[PDB]
């Protein structure tokens, strides 16, 4: 749980493999349906990849490692070595597929992405399905490590196995996707799904991460969907398996909960209420080793009354840390950028991406302050300067990012940039 991963890639080939092919743990939640086209939430898949000095790294499975992107055969390298395959801990290798229906999570939990182990299909036409809007959410996701793995290598023809992969590794650079290489993997040719535990988990390996830093936990997701008429013994803390922003889950941690409930006369600024969220719950994907570190993606369990946030209420908020800095002050400074790559749909004539505008009154304006998208009737807006404000304390140690999607139409877009106060 010290360093995790993410993903990004084009569309229109079928990502029933780029979601859960060799992710270690499957992808399923309350009404998830792992991959119709792609998934949208950025979570935590429990698995521990490790090598044994043989041409591929033995997966957390102590016998072999393979994928599900071929129906009869897929040429691949050697598997590694058996013998109760070793590992360190829950070194998450998470994946964010080619769907963008979770921009709230794709802006809250995005910035907790350490690496990015991805795939990039090769069944693309001239207009870009997932290379025109799906790069407008994880632009500042703090994942310097990334590998946009080309997929079509044997099945797509010469003019599809290399059609838009390079034309995105050069023209999908608005976010950190082009600067990512193509480590040998495939969601359209099944290129050595075993070698994706060494040539991927070591090409974008778990970067040197924070080992004892602040427990600045900004919870990205919460887990409770049980049916009404509550069950026997569902009175506990969080239960949340995902990617928390930061946090040293060391011996005896706590959470200086600044945002929490409404502060005293909550048109105010500050508060003081630590509700200890004990740190004992982090299984390291192979053993009960919870001496974790900030950076990864794991399944944490809080210690609070669950009522307030057992359901989807612990995304955007935070669990406090040492160094009680976090900026619970909506009225701060923040900035954003306009549209150059058209989000939601695009064109090749500068027709749906040329113009830009600002906000005003007698209207509504949704902006993604830090993790939470809120706003409304804005006073004004400058060229590239913003006097950002809101109606609640979005308490994080900083104040990044915005949302270029108010209440507009059936869907939403993203054109902004990142500015911290």
């Amino acid at each position: 749980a010290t360093i995790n991963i993410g993903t990004i890639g084009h569309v229109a080939h079928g990502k029933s493999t780029v979601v859960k092919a060799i992710s270690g743990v499957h992808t399923v939640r309350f009404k998830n349906e792992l991959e119709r086209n792609i998934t949208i939430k950025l979570g935590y898949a429990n698995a521990k990849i490790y090598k044994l000095d043989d041409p591929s790294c033995p997966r957390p499975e102590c016998y072999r490692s393979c994928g599900s992107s071929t129906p009869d055969e897929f040429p691949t390298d050697i598997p590694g070595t058996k013998g109760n395959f070793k590992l360190v801990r829950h070194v998450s290798f998470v994946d964010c597929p080619g769907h963008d229906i979770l921009m709230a999570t794709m802006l809250n939990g995005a910035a907790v992405m350490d690496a990015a182990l991805l795939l990039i299909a090769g069944n693309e036409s001239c207009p870009q399905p997932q290379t025109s809007e799906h790069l407008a959410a994880i632009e500042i996701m703090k994942l310097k490590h990334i590998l946009i793995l080309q997929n079509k290598i044997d099945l797509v023809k010469e003019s599809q196995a290399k059609e838009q992969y390079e034309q995105i590794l050069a023209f999908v650079q608005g976010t950190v996707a082009e600067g990512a290489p193509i480590i040998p993997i495939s969601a359209q040719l099944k290129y050595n799904i075993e070698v994706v535990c060494e040539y991927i988990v070591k090409k974008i390996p778990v970067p040197p991460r924070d080992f004892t830093s602040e427990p600045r936990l900004i919870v990205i997701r919460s887990f409770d969907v049980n049916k009404p008429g509550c069950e026997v013994d569902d009175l506990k803390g969080g239960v949340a398996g995902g990617s928390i922003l930061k946090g040293v889950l060391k011996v005896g941690q706590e959470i200086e909960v600044r945002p929490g409930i409404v502060s005293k006369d909550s048109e105010g600024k500050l508060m003081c209420k630590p509700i200890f969220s004990k740190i004992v719950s982090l299984f390291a994907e192979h053993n009960d080793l919870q001496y974790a570190a900030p950076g990864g993606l794991i399944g944490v369990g809080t210690k609070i009354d669950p009522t307030l946030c057992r359901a989807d209420r612990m995304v955007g908020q935070v669990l406090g840390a040492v160094g009680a800095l976090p900026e619970i002050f909506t009225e701060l400074e923040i900035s954003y950028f306009l549209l150059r790559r058209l989000l939601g749909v695009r064109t090749e004539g500068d027709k749906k991406a040329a113009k830009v505008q600002k906000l005003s009154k007698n209207e509504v304006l949704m902006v993604n302050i830090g993790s939470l998208s809120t706003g409304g009737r804005v006073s004004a807006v400058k060229a590239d300067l913003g006097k950002i404000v809101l109606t609640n304390p979005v308490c994080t140690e900083v104040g990044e990012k915005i949302a270029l999607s108010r209440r507009v139409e059936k869907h939403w877009r993203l054109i902004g940039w990142g500015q911290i106060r």
Partner: peptide
């Protein structure tokens, strides 16, 4: 690295 080009040049004929 040494496996992407290997897949690409060893499944070119069989895989259409």
């Amino acid at each position: 690295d040494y496996t992407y080009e290997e897949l690409l040049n060893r499944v070119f004929n069989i895989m259409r």
